[model samples]
Target: KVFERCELARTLKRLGMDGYRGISLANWMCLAKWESGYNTRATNYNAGDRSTDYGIFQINSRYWCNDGKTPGAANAAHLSCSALLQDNIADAVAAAKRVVRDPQGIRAWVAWRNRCQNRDVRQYVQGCGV
Candidate 1:
């Protein structure tokens, strides 16, 4: 499902994602925009690595979710990658929280690494009133 930026922000806030672990809502918003364009159905198939990234957070099947082929996949979120493709984002948020607890923190997302790293991301929540 597609979500307006403000609505998405509000929903995220309700999910207590504003300060999940050590990652900020601003950072999460920026990462979401870059990763999935606010669409839950978003999926990226990396042919080079034969892996898939799913949902708004683009949870990686190789390391975060089971794709049913990679022996002993991390499945850190204990969820199927397909589950994140639905409009409901509770699972996605839960999964993201697990990722944030990792040593690299928000850098778990390449978009955060390339675009949001060390930047003033307040603009991402400009009018959301979060």
Candidate 2:
């Protein structure tokens, strides 16, 4: 339930509308599952560089928490500065947007995953961040 509501697929439905306008829901779901297992609270401790990445989007701690000023709040859509600081969708929809500025852009999230593990998301996955 939580994954459906907060995963990259939902994020696209909510925020990537314009960019992902042509992408299929099924495709997005496939990619999301592979990326974070649809785990909104997922994190990668094996960044291979001693860095920490957090949440479904797995944004590096520095950018995500603003260099520890914010901390893991980015993992929780409800209690994060991203929810209160950026455009309102902060809860579910906004969190997705924060991950990618492009509707089909999930490449940034994917890149983080691969960089940390030598794994790559599907080629179709879009790269977005604004």
Candidate 3:
């Protein structure tokens, strides 16, 4: 799903992403924007680690989810990476919550650091009634 900004914000808020793990819904919105541009089916294959990133949040297969090829087997979300690619974002949202349970929090996504960190992320949800 290619979500419009405010729509995605309302959806993520409905899914309980607002202020989750000390991360704001706007920050989540920011992360999703830069990671996958709010496209649920987007994916990127990582050549260096042989892992793949999946879904709107771009949850990676190596540490957080399984893709059947990664040997690391941490499977932090205990979810198949395939589940993250669905048009429905429920599983993706769950996995994102799991990722931020760690000390790294939302910093697990490098894109957030490069594009969202310390910026005026409120722009992401500016008109959304979240």
Candidate 4:
């Protein structure tokens, strides 16, 4: 699904993404905009690590989801990459939390630092009634 700004924000709000770890909803809004344009089908194939980034958050493989090709692919304990691609954001949102919950925090996504860090991210959530 390709989500509009505030619609996505509202959805994220419903999922408790407002301040999962002290980061604002606008920050998350900015992150998803830059990373996947709020599209669940968005995918980026990374040749460097043979991992693919999936979903709105662009959660990368061994960032715990597994695909067919990667060698150090996540073990049986991990979920599949498709888990991040469904229209239902619940699973993907869970993976997103996993990505951010690490010590790296939002810095796990370099795009956030380059684009969302200390910027006018409120525009991403403006008029969303957030």
* Top-lDDT structure, candidate number: 3
What lDDT would each prediction earn against the true structure?
A: 0.88, 0.45, 0.91, 0.85
Q: Rank the candidates by TM-score, best first.
A: 3, 1, 4, 2
> Please, what are the lDDT tens digits per residue for candidate 2 over residues 50-112?
555545445554443432443333442224423322322235345445545545355556543
Full ranking by lDDT: 3, 1, 4, 2
Per-residue lDDT tens digits for candidate 1, residues 18-106, read: 88877788889999999999999998888877788999989998888887865446788888888899899999999998888889888
For candidate 3, write residues 53-119 as lDDT tens digits: 9999999888889888876757989998889988889999999999999999999889999999989
Residue 130 of model 4, lDDT score:
83
| Candidate 3: stretches off by over 4 Å | none
Error of model 1, residue 84, in angstroms: 0.5
Positional deviation of residue 95's Cα in model 3 after best superposition, in angstroms: 0.2
Q: Local error of candidate 4 at 19, Å?
A: 0.9
- Return the TM-score for candidate 4, rounded to 2 decimals: 0.93
Across residues 12-121, which tens digit of lDDT does each residue of candidate 4 receive?
A: 99999989999899999999999999998899988877788888888878646888777777623267888778888888887787777779989989999999997888
- By TM-score, the better pick of 1 and 3 is 3
TM-score of each: 0.93, 0.44, 0.96, 0.93
Ten contiguous residues minimizing lDDT sum, candidate 2: 81-90
